[PDB]
Amino acid sequence: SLLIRGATVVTHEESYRADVLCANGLIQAIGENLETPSGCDVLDGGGQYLMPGGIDPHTHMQLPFMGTVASEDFFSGTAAGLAGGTTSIIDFVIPNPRQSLLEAFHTWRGWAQKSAADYGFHVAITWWSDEVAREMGELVAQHGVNSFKHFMAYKNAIMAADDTLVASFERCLELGAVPTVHAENGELVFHLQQKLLAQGLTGPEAHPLSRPPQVEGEAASRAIRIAETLGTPLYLVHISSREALDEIAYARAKGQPVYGEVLAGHLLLDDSVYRHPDWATAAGYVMSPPFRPVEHQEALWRGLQSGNLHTTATDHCCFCAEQKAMGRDDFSKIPNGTAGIEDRMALLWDAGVNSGRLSMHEFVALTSTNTAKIFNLFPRKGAIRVGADADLVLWDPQGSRTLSAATHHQRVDFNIFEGRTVRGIPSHTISQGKLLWAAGDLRAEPGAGRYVERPAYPSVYEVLGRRAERQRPVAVER
Amino acid sequence: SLLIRGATVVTHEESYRADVLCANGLIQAIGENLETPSGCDVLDGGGQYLMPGGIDPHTHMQLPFMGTVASEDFFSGTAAGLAGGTTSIIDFVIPNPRQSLLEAFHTWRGWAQKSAADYGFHVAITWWSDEVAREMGELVAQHGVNSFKHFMAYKNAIMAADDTLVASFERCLELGAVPTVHAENGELVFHLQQKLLAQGLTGPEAHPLSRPPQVEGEAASRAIRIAETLGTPLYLVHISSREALDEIAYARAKGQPVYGEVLAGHLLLDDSVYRHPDWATAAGYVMSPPFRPVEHQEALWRGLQSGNLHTTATDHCCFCAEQKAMGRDDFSKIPNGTAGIEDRMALLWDAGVNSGRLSMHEFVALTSTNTAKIFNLFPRKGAIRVGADADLVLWDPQGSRTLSAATHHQRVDFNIFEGRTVRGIPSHTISQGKLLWAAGDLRAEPGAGRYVERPAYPSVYEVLGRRAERQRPVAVER
Ligand SMILES: [Zn+2]
Ligand SMILES: [Zn+2]
Ligand SMILES: [Zn+2]
Ligand SMILES: [Zn+2]
């Protein structure tokens, strides 16, 4: 067992001094001056904040691309998360077109066995048939999946057009599953890529021009209004633009359950990174959606503060210099992705809490509790309460860290915040009740993490079901 | 020649006392106590307002449907328009899928030859190919077309998907033509129609349910953001919902050239009309987009007052009871459309000007001048100035009329404003300088109207071109 003594417990709504006892993977006792069971390790939390461990609902460990694969695998990635205070992830099973969803799922489960910390899967709907629909039923009922991902970009690859979006959202409703969407208009992205390439604009500086913010705003509007029409909730991954944020606020202002996820990169970086004179440096920032002009950063902070953005994630998707250079003559061939799992909570604490933009309670809500609630993992995760999973982070408000590809634990040779010094760091990270990160020493072990099942029918479907009862149409008697 | 003496001239910006002399189709002189040329007819305008004749940019005279055609033809519709103060129309050439646009154009010119007042055509892009693109250029260069219509609804028929919208809008930009769009999400409409019919809801009350307002809002957002991305203007026909209007205002707030058209029906009727216990009465209201819950009418009036809705039209598309009854067992087979060309200006004067919602100058802008400017017909039309076309209406602010299918001149057995009494009516209508409507006497003659060519490149393209140069992508030198 493990007892954290002397800390201030900080949740998504309150702070209070208390000790916390963990055993058998769970929180067993909370209170002042708890007794110590015999042979129990004791961590001295004086002067620090004890918080739920971060949940990163957006990762892509060892995701295949071309004949190559993300340079971070499920062990190195989950270990790097632990070093940064993140104690569990939700990754993505991405079937090839016409490939069995269950086949892809078992493959990814094999890849994920080596994880060092708890993990789960979204499953992407990259094509449609009666069989896909039946397979999502089996994934929900027998494999712990409760959320399905849709890509509106990637024409002539995994794009979900309207008819797939409609059939699949309808299926999610039947199953009590949460539809999630990468919102970018695939036709416009494809058209702009071709236009820019024909102009000889082949460098990384053309990447953001190929998918400007209104391309994301349009896709968000469309996914949102499909969800409204079919009567499902909707989770929009990595919101980067004022345009898309505004569509979310509009829908939430109509009563509709729409959630938005944001990455630290899109809160803190602007699109000038793509004009760096060194090709490799500019290519290190290539991801979709791309980093944006500054006015969007301000708008996103506003969403977080006003409750129209709800979770943070990383889109952790690592490619080293030689992989990025596959697009040296064609930016559309640059493997898209940036690293962030190790860095998310310190970036957010330092930019959000130290500034006074966010309270520490909002910080917890935005790094674990909201994600737990949305995907039906609360209070098993994101909660400091007796019986909850013992996933915790001890936080030193006066510690500092300089982010650097030379020192980080992420298996990648680039950091989009290279040289940034933050104040406020995870001094200790506890997963399943075990101390896996301590004072610069990572103790992660391959195979330690568990596959985490998520039950269907989160609370929102009760509300939605009563709405549909009252909107049931009624014929006119004539 | 025709001299209108003693009236108050009312334009889109000012009012003043003056006589107006017409000859050889044109306004020849404006001023007080104008000399009377010998043989000149004189019209006493004392106590009345003289404004530009209405322009209705959205009519469907004798539109073919299944085995039948709209019950109004090009003569009877333009004659009814004249009785209502409207002196010219823009109709639609609608080629069948895979049919030559030029072939359809010539057929429609043959049909419209019988018009009693000036007329022109938008051309609908109902399918796509290189030849479609070639023909658009020939239509602009040789046949006086400068606007192309796109239907986002009507799946499995004439829907333009994103790839056609992109390709066609790009062609519009190369040609200096205005893209126009019927904005409803056709996949959602199709889905809801099938789901309602499978629940046995076959009556007209199911029609509004099959295309709720967010379906128009989504499509508007998508067309707006394609136009933004391709750098074209955009004209949205018959806006009916707060959602779509909000998308227009959002784009206009960012400086984008987006125009919205509205029908009197959507300003003054609500969706309760579809629950009328008489089937034929409810079916008389069935058009797309449908009439809306009452919050939407208020929003549209504010759109008119704020400059975010720009033109009025009727979507004049007449079907008699026996034709409407084609969908007695299946609302989706009711021919869609209502009549309004005769009624538009009185309805808007009586509801807008009498109430203080609209100035008299806004009334002129909304019934002629804005349409003329948008489609590059100003100041030929929509203007009271020497050398402009002598298309005029003399308006009696104290005259009254009761709208009725029993007394209107539209060749249709239904009026969606049956029994409504309006104050402020056109006492006289002048077209090409001839008195064609005078105190209840309709003098319209088949073939009197002229085909009206609209030159390409309205002024908005000049500013768009400077914008595009200023926003040029610039390669990074490395
Ligand atoms: Zn994505
Ligand atoms: Zn992703
Ligand atoms: Zn229409
Ligand atoms: Zn129409």
CATH assignment at residue A85: 3.20.20.140
- Is residue A254 marked as binding? no
**Chain B interface, best mutation among A168, A194, A209, A222, by max B CB count within 10 A:** A222
Find out whether the peptide bond into A379 is cis, omega within 30 degrees of 0: yes
3-state secondary structure of A9: strand
**Per the structure block, which two tokens stand in for A363?**
């910080």
Number of other CB atoms surrounding residue B249 within 10 Å: 18
Ligand 3: distance of its center to the CA of B182 in Å? 5
Within-domain flag for B32:
yes
Q: Which residues of A are less than 8 Å from B162 in CB distance? A: 185, 187-188
Cα–Cα dist B35/B186, whole Å: 59
Experimentally determined by: X-ray
Two tokens at A123? 């499953």
Torsion of CA B151, B247, B305, B390, to 10 degrees: -30
Give the list of residues 6+ apart from residue B441 with CB closer than 8 angstroms, or none: none
Query: What are the angstrom distances between the C-alpha of B302 and each of B4, B246, B306, B398?
Result: 35, 11, 6, 26
Measured from the alpha carbon of residue A58, the closest ligand is 2
End-to-end Cα separation, chain A, in angstroms: 73
CA of A63 to the centre of ligand 2 (A): 10
Count the Cβ atoms, other than its own, within 10 Å of residue A38. 5
* A58 annotated as a binding-site residue: yes
DSSP letters spanning A165-210: HHHHHHHHHHHTPEEEEE---HHHHHHHHHHHHHTT--STTHHHHT
Q: Which one-letter amino acid corresponds to residue B398?
A: Q
- Whether A198 and A222 have beta carbons less than 8 Å apart is answered as no
Query: Three-state SS for A71?
Result: coil
Domain count, chain A: 1
The sign of the dihedral angle between the CA atoms of A190, A191, A195, A198 is: positive
Q: Where are the alpha helices (DSSP H) in B285-329?
A: 294-306, 321-324
CB B383 within 8 A of CB B372: yes
> Which residue matches tokens 């459309």?
B337
Task: Give residue ranges of A with CB < 8 Å to any B CB.
Answer: 162-163, 166, 185, 187-188, 191-192, 196, 199-201, 203-206, 209, 212, 214-215, 217-218, 221-222, 225-226, 228-229, 246-247, 250, 275-279, 282, 473, 475-478
The contacts of residue B228 (CB under 8 Å, 6+ apart) are: A214, B251, B256
Contact A203 B228 (CB under 8 A): no
- Helix, strand or coil for residue A389? strand
Residues listed for chain A: 478
Structure tokens at A99: 């490939």
Alpha-carbon dihedral angle through residues A321, A322, A323, A325, given to the nearest 10 degrees = 80
Contact B30, B51 (CB under 8 A): no
Task: Look at strands A311-313 and A258-263 and give their pairing.
Answer: parallel
Domain-embedded: residue A469 = no
User: Rounded to a whole number, what is the distance in angstroms from the first to the last CA of chain B?
Assistant: 72
User: Within a domain: residue A337?
Assistant: yes
Q: Which of B230, B227, B251, B234 is nearest to B147 (CA)?
A: B234
The domain containing residue B394 runs over which residues?
A: 1-440
Distance (angstroms) between ligand 4 centre and the Cα of B105 equals 17
Instruction: Examine residue A166 and state whether it is found in any structural domain, yes or no.
Output: yes
Ligand nearest to the CA of A60: 2
Q: Which chain A residues touch B203 with a CB distance below 8 Å?
A: 475-476, 478
Question: What are all long-range contacts of B71-74, with beta carbons under 8 Å and residues at least 24 apart?
Answer: B71/B318, B71/B319, B71/B320, B71/B323, B71/B411, B71/B412, B71/B413, B72/B316, B72/B318, B72/B339, B72/B410, B72/B411, B72/B412, B73/B111, B73/B114, B73/B411, B74/B111, B74/B112, B74/B113, B74/B114, B74/B115, B74/B119
Q: Do B476 and A205 touch (CB under 8 A)?
A: yes
Minimum-distance ligand to the CA of B158? 3
Q: How far is CA A371 from CA A78, A261, A381, B33, B382, in A?
A: 17, 9, 9, 78, 58
Q: Which two tokens stand for residue A342?
A: 């190790």
Rounded to the nearest 10°, the torsion over CA B321, B325, B327, B331 is 50
Residue B338 domain flag: yes
Report the chain A residue with the minimal C-alpha distance to residue B162. A187
Helix intervals (H) in B113-234: 130-142, 162-175, 186-198, 206-209, 213-230
**CA A96, CA A151: separation in Å to the nearest integer?**
13
| Position B449 in a domain | no
The amino acid occupying position A245 is L
Q: What are phi and psi of A95, to 5 degrees?
A: -60, 140
Residue B337 Cα, ligand 4 centroid: separation in angstroms? Answer: 8
Structural domain contains residue A47: yes
Q: How open is the CA angle A392-A396-A398, to the nearest 5 degrees? A: 165
CA nearest neighbour of A224 among A234, A214, A216, A215:
A234
Hey, what's the torsion of the CAs at A5, A7, A11, A16, to 10 degrees?
Answer: 100
Transcribe A228-295 into DSSP letters: HHHT--EEE-S---HHHHHHHHHHHTTT--EEEEEEHHHHH-BGGGGG-SSHHHHHTT--SSPPB-HH
Q: Do A187 and B206 touch (CB under 8 A)?
A: no
B445 within a domain of the structure (yes/no):
no
DSSP-derived pairing of the beta strands A441-442 and A434-438 = antiparallel
Kind plus residue range of the DSSP H or E element containing B397: strand B392-402
Q: Which helix (H) or strand (E) element contains residue B77?
A: helix B74-83
